[PDB]
Amino acid sequence: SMKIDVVTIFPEYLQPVRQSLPGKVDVAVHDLRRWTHDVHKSVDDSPYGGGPGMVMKPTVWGDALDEICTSETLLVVPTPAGYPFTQETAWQWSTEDHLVIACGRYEGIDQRVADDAATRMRVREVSIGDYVLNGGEAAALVIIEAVLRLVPGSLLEGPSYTRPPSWRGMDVPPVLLSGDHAKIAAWRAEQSRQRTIERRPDLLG
Amino acid sequence: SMKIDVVTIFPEYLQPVRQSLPGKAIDAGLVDVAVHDLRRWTHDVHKSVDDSPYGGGPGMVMKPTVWGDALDEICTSETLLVVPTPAGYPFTQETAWQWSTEDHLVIACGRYEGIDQRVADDAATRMRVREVSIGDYVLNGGEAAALVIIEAVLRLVPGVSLLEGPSYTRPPSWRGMDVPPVLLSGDHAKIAAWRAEQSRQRTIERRPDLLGFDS
Ligand SMILES: Nc1ccccc1-c1cnco1
Numbered sequence: 001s002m003k004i005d006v007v008t009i010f011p012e013y014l015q016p017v018r019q020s021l022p023g024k025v026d027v028a029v030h031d032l033r034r035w036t037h038d039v040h041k042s043v044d045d046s047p048y049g050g051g052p053g054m055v056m057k058p059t060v061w062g063d064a065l066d067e068i069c070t071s072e073t074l075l076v077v078p079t080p081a082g083y084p085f086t087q088e089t090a091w092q093w094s095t096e097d098h099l100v101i102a103c104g105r106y107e108g109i110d111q112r113v114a115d116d117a118a119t120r121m122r123v124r125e126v127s128i129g130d131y132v133l134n135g136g137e138a139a140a141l142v143i144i145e146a147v148l149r150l151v152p153g154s155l156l157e158g159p160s161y162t163r164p165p166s167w168r169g170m171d172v173p174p175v176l177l178s179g180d181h182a183k184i185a186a187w188r189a190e191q192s193r194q195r196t197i198e199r200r201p202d203l204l205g
Numbered sequence: 206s207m208k209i210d211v212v213t214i215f216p217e218y219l220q221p222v223r224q225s226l227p228g229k230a231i232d233a234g235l236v237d238v239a240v241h242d243l244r245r246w247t248h249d250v251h252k253s254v255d256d257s258p259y260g261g262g263p264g265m266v267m268k269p270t271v272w273g274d275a276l277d278e279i280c281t282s283e284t285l286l287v288v289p290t291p292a293g294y295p296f297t298q299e300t301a302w303q304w305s306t307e308d309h310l311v312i313a314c315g316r317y318e319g320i321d322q323r324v325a326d327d328a329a330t331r332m333r334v335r336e337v338s339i340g341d342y343v344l345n346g347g348e349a350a351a352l353v354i355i356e357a358v359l360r361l362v363p364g365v366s367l368l369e370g371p372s373y374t375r376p377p378s379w380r381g382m383d384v385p386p387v388l389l390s391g392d393h394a395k396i397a398a399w400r401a402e403q404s405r406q407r408t409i410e411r412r413p414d415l416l417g418f419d420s
């Protein structure tokens with residue numbers, strides 16, 4: 001049984017993932033503006049030390065996490081400056097009772113929010129890849145998907161084929177129709193080797 | 206002006222593209238994003254898009270016939286066909302910059318155990334095709350990757366190294382935690398330096414690979 005709370009100023013981004021799950025795991029989405037202070041519902045402010053963009057306010061985020069998090073919570077913060085989120089990470093988090101995902105803008109959440117939370121609960125700042133998003137919402141979607149599909153409920157993969165055996169002048173590799181399953185395995189292994197060399201030589205060292 | 210077509214068996218799942226950066230870009234007319242139900246190109250009553258794999262293995266493979274018809278209608282020779290897949294070349298910031306100047310992106314979202322390889326092979330005889338991974342984690346399908354790609358690319362469209370260090374804003378003291386004094390000093394040189402040192406610490410600790418170190 002896993003509970004996921006997402007906090008975001010774009011709550012509608014996450015509805016189409018909440019309404020996708022089967023046997024209700026529970027996924028709840030919260031509008032950050034619930035915890036604003038002022039009639040203007042301000043969530044960000046100018047960065048100390050100058051610079052472009054805006055930093056998300058610690059007083060707002062602090063109130064939101066205070067309400068939603070407990071000592072058992074794993075607080076996940078998608079950020080370009082995060083540790084890499086991997087399948088290993090997904091496996092670890094799949095056994096957790098409570099994930100809270102804090103979605104911020106690219107510019108960031110005041111660092112004191114995470115630092116303060118970390119004195120009471122486990123906090124994980126994570127990046128899903130080396131590209132820049134405008135905010136953490138899309139990364140939250142990726143994390144939610146990768147984690148939840150592992151909830152009870154190396155080399156690259158090579159090419160796959162299905163019917164028909166011949167399509168637009170291209171035949172399915174005859175070995176796959178051979179009924180020689182040791183040979184098929186060996187062929188697939190060689191396809192995986194070639195593809196890993198070509199596309200992901202980093203995986204080979 | 207850019208056109209993005211997304212083809213998926215879950216068109217409703219691509220509706221998050223309607224807010225945030227992408228939504229604003231669409232509203233401002235800098236991009237048009239159209240989502241297509243793959244099952245529109247089926248002809249049987251059960252609208253079957255998948256079948257069991259040749260050679261054996263777990264799960265199902267998406268049929269080339271349906272994809273071929275869909276891509277025939279949506280793509281031209283100028284199209285950049287994007288296929289998210291765990292076995293793809295890495296999608297990076299460099300890729301996002303490159304695709305940001307494209308006139309037409311078509312994103313094919315796969316489900317089950319993948320799309321028959323001949324779909325990509327056939328398309329490549331007629332247009333540029335890019336199979337890409339957005340990271341080494343396993344998704345159920347290409348839909349979430351499409352959303353990531355769209356966001357990363359659209360924020361670079363005209364009109365729309367080292368890790369970033371910590372950022373701070375008001376108030377200067379919060380829960381007994383103070384903003385680093387150097388940031389309040391207005392000394393642009395000392396601030397630039399502190400920020401450089403923070404990023405170094407963070408990059409070495411979290412992403413040593415960026416600086417050419419192990420793990
Ligand atoms: N660029 C970002 C901006 C804001 C929140 C997360 C990210 C992110 C996470 N992984 C890659 O990018």
Ligand SMILES: Nc1ccccc1-c1cnco1
Pocket residue numbers: 289290291315316337338339340341342343344345346347348350
């Ligand atoms: N795992 C997947 C399954 C289907 C379509 C894309 C992916 C993917 C791409 N990059 C990471 O995951």
